[PDB]
Amino acid sequence: ETITVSTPIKQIFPDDAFAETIKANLKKKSVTDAVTQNELNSIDQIIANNSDIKSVQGIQYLPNLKTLKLSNNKITDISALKQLNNLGWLDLSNNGITDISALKNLASLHTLDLSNNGITDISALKNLDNLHTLDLSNNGITDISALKNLDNLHTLDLSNNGITDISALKNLTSLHTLDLSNNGITDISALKNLDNLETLDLRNNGITDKSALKNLNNLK
Numbered sequence: 001e002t003i004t005v006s007t008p009i010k011q012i013f014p015d016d017a018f019a020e021t022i023k024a025n026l027k028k029k030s031v032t033d034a035v036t037q038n039e040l041n042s043i044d045q046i047i048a049n050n051s052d053i054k055s056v057q058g059i060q061y062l063p064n065l066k067t068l069k070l071s072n073n074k075i076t077d078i079s080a081l082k083q084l085n086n087l088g089w090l091d092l093s094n095n096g097i098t099d100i101s102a103l104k105n106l107a108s109l110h111t112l113d114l115s116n117n118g119i120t121d122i123s124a125l126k127n128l129d130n131l132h133t134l135d136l137s138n139n140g141i142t143d144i145s146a147l148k149n150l151d152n153l154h155t156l157d158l159s160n161n162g163i164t165d166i167s168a169l170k171n172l173t174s175l176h177t178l179d180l181s182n183n184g185i186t187d188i189s190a191l192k193n194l195d196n197l198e199t200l201d202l203r204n205n206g207i208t209d210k211s212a213l214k215n216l217n218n219l220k
Helices: 016-025 037-041 211-215
Strands: 045-047 067-069 089-091 111-113 133-135 155-157 177-179 199-201
Parallel strands (some): 045 067, 067 089, 133 155
16 A cells, blocks of 8 residues: 555545644645655654544555554544554554454554443454553453453453453463453453462452452462
């Protein structure tokens, strides 16, 4: 995905606010100034939180993008992230995201914050082997079996969902920080073998048997 003609920023990036961000990243004078693919290749980091962004259309032309933080905007469609192979840190928290299949092949992702969206299906996360830090709180997640081979996870927040079954966590032995609060969990035997947990929150579930926590030594 490249542009081949020098093109106004506002034409590539139609969202008012997102175009301003690109303009500022490239130190251009106006969103109507023309930019080249070469210039777009230079962009490796975009931070535009709290900015009323409605669309990231145009972002597909930023192949070297590594860090993208877009917390608290109005983003609903992220399909244009699909081929950004070099993304490492993605924060899309507080948006209106539902479908995340666009994340499916982002093999370099290591830090992902998707909290406070409308996500239900997370099977697109299943092959993101480099994830160590994942925040999925305040969504509508019920099935978490996509997490089961993400064994580089060390920090996981699954609070405020509709999760009932957590056997998917049983072999995530590198977990040290886990938030499971405000779900529908009843059985935590899956946590038995997470010997490196220091911080755990299980409040507001339907758990009665807590003997699995007795032998977790590094807990606070």
